[PDB]
Amino acid sequence: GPSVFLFPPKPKDTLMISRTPEVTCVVVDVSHEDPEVKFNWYVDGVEVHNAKTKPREEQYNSTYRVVSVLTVLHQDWLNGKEYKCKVSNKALPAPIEKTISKAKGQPREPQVYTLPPSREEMTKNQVSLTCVVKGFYPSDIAVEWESNGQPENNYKTTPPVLDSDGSFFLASKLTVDKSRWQQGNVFSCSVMHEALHNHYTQKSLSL
């Protein structure tokens, strides 16, 4: 029969009041014979009715993919409400239920530090700027880089790693031309996390 996958909203969407966070209930392996799917949604046990079914999508491996999207309130999510998707279909003996929410636990504020390139790397054509983010809980986060109000896209960020005190840490590395660094340009690491004042902090770094 069909299989169901329930996905949380993007950290950024939950964290920026100008964005719309949504939870997504994806049903795969829906058959051509019975494409009809019924969604029921629940927030902390209480049925809500504002979910919207996305356009049905032919997959070409014999099956359909059917998607229900539920808009959620920023604070609802951050307060840790539980969102239940229940899926019914003729090819299913019993309806399938899935539930996600934010990881549980007392949110902790990340400390953010920027680290300039090692002198040993000043030999290379490009150089690394390090943004250390440690002591955050829960692991939901967004890290980006910018300079002169423009996004700098040449970075990579590690996954978060569970530290020994029960919080998380990560490192984000931005790779700039050495010239750009030597010319005095200011580079900024932006961190969005629920436990930061206004979900936001910025740290800057220059020669």
Binding site: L15, S18, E146, N198, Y200
Partner: peptide, 13 residues
């Protein structure tokens, strides 16, 4: 006060 990210509203308290 409020926070902005590349000119987009983040959050206000």
């Amino acid at each position: 006060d409020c926070a902005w990210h590349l000119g987009e509203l983040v959050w206000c308290t």
